[PDB]
Amino acid sequence: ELSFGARAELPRIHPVASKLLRLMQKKETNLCLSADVSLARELLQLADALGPSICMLKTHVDILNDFTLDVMKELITLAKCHEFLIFENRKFADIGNTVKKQYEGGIFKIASWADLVNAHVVPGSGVVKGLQEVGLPLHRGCLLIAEMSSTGSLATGDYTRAAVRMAEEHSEFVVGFISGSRVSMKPEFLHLTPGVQLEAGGDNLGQQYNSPQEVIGKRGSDIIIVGRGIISAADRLEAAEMYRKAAWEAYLSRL
Amino acid sequence: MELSFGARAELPRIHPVASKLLRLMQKKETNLCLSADVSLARELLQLADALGPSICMLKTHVDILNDFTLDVMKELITLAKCHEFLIFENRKFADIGNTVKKQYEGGIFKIASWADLVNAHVVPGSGVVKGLQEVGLPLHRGCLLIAEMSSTGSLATGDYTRAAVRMAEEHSEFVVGFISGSRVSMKPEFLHLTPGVQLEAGGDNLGQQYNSPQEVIGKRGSDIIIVGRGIISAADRLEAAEMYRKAAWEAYLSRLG
Ligand SMILES: O=C(O)c1cc(=O)[nH]c(=O)n1[C@@H]1O[C@H](COP(=O)(O)O)[C@@H](O)[C@H]1O
Ligand SMILES: O=C(O)c1cc(=O)[nH]c(=O)n1[C@@H]1O[C@H](COP(=O)(O)O)[C@@H](O)[C@H]1O
After folding, report:
1. CATH 3.20.20.70: does it fit domain A1-255?
2. C-alpha span between B197 and B229 (Å, rounded)
3. A38 contacts in B (CB within 8 Å)?
4. A217 lines ligand 1 (CB under 6 A)
């Protein structure tokens, strides 16, 4: 088991992964905030106030009612100031020819501002080869969805193994996984885990929660992704700190 | 028994959106869905106007449309009503239920406001359908589940495809069919829509694989062909659409008997 700082220096490490691992060690946070808010002002307010506490901010551009590329310019400034990466939520999950345009184009131009994107592996490896065409020139990274947190997920067994092989064979662009646990034994890959709350439970639409201790400590993942656990709290600053402190200590303990 | 689209439109358990589709298919003799992955609204609208009479559906790619406004979608709706086709947005809904409802309803695009049909990947489990349904049900919208894919290395096989079929059958108030390479359900109320179709053999350099209208409709038992590059790359996109329409329509007539 290597520290985040050491992993950032691995020969085969991807630049985006290195930058992330560095800032994680520096700031003592392996917490990614999921900010699914409908107003640009809310997104920017949250990112400024919680920026110190997070390694990464998961955006949801598809639901921002007043998206503009200027908002993203401003977000990037915050990102650079507080030191966190930007991970857009959009689930790329089409054939390679189509995902390329989805990633680069349209009103959102996701590749022009997102350090990280995620893709589903269901279409086969063409999904990654397509993204890569746009992502590599722009010096970007990609996470593959190897497992999901929701009830009835089909991202199990051979599907998960297929995800891991895909990542390992496209390591110039793929830097990690969305998963519920460690799924790759190569320490160059990041594991990011959604479906995280301090308390037991779920939501009324299939979400299932596990704690930071369970996911980071017992299941060997690297980063927790938390949305409602923080956003719905009365004091969001305090919430983000509780989740950061939880995940960080689980990591240290594993070391 | 094989039934005509017109007959299927009258099936007891048929969804209103499926029935509207099936009836215009029969009336217009077309089971062709144009995939218009273009970056400009003028091209989209010009294609929708010129090919409108030849298609039963238009697959939009709003994420790629550089000059999207809701007013463009307003004009598309006009053309869809005039020429009689449904609007099917390509966006792959593939998140947990709570998240997909906002993606469908909201943001700048407000996809549920103008799309007759959406598609979802089934990998998140049935939550993905429940979330979409909370928005789309009152709007008489329908959902297609992605049961199989046309690309090399597709994981939508075996138990995965079966899970897709079961999910649709258990949510038939909202799920109206499949994206698939063949008939995957025996229930005639469900539509089968097949991408990866060109008149000529081949593929692309990023994993796409093609089969002909004759194969997919006639031998594999699908209902509708989805075609992008086969039409969009032609000099004459109207001529090309007519060729695909006649191919798919005759293939359907063949298995009808
Ligand atoms: O991409 C993800 O992180 C995602 C996949 C998954 O398997 N589970 C999952 O919860 N998500 C997303 O992670 C976030 C979890 O948010 P909360 O449940 O509010 O903490 C939401 O944006 C989900 O859409
Ligand atoms: O969502 C789809 O229809 C999709 C699934 C699939 O398995 N295969 C597939 O080709 N598609 C889409 O269908 C269209 C095919 O385009 P052409 O390959 O240009 O005919 C594109 O919009 C693809 O993204």
Report:
1. yes
2. 9
3. 102, 106-107
4. no
Cβ-contact A79, A114 below 8 angstroms: no
| B153:A101 CB<8 A | no
B37 lines ligand 2 (CB under 6 A): yes
Token couple for B208:
């796409």
d(CA A235, CA A248): 20
CA of B129 to the centre of ligand 1 (A): 16
Tokens of B182: 């063949």
Overall resolution, Å: 1.9
**Residue given tokens 């719905």 in the structure block:** A232
Q: What is the DSSP string of A111-169?
A: GGT-SEEEEESTT-THHHHHHHHHHTTTT-EEEEE---SSTT----THHHHHHHHHHHT
Contact assessment for residue A53 and residue A241, using Cβ atoms and an 8 Å cutoff: yes
Reported CATH class of domain B1-257: alpha beta
Query: What is d(CA A109, CA A208) in angstroms, rounded to the nearest whole number?
Result: 32
Please tell me the distance from the alpha carbon of residue A121 to that of residue A159, in angstroms, as a whole number: 8
Which residues in chain B (122-151) have CB-CB distances under 8 A to chain A? Answer: 122-128, 130-131, 146, 149-151
Q: Are A56 and A20 in contact (CB under 8 A)?
A: yes
What one-letter code names the amino acid at B89?
E
> Which among A16, A116, A113 has a CA at the least distance from the CA of A72?
A113
Amino acid type, A226: V
- SS3 string of A3-30? CHHHHCCCCCCCHHHHHHHHHHHHHCCC
Residue whose C-alpha is closest to residue B152's, from B202, B192, B88: B202
b/e sequence A175-186, b meaning 16+ C-beta within 10 Å: bbbbbbbbbbee
Q: What angle do CA A161, A164, A139 make, to 5 degrees?
A: 160
Query: Method of determination?
Result: X-ray
Local structure of residue A196 (DSSP, 8 states): B
Q: Which two tokens stand for residue A27?
A: 């700031």
With 0-12 CB in 10 A as exposed, 13-18 as middle and 19+ as buried, what is A192?
Answer: buried
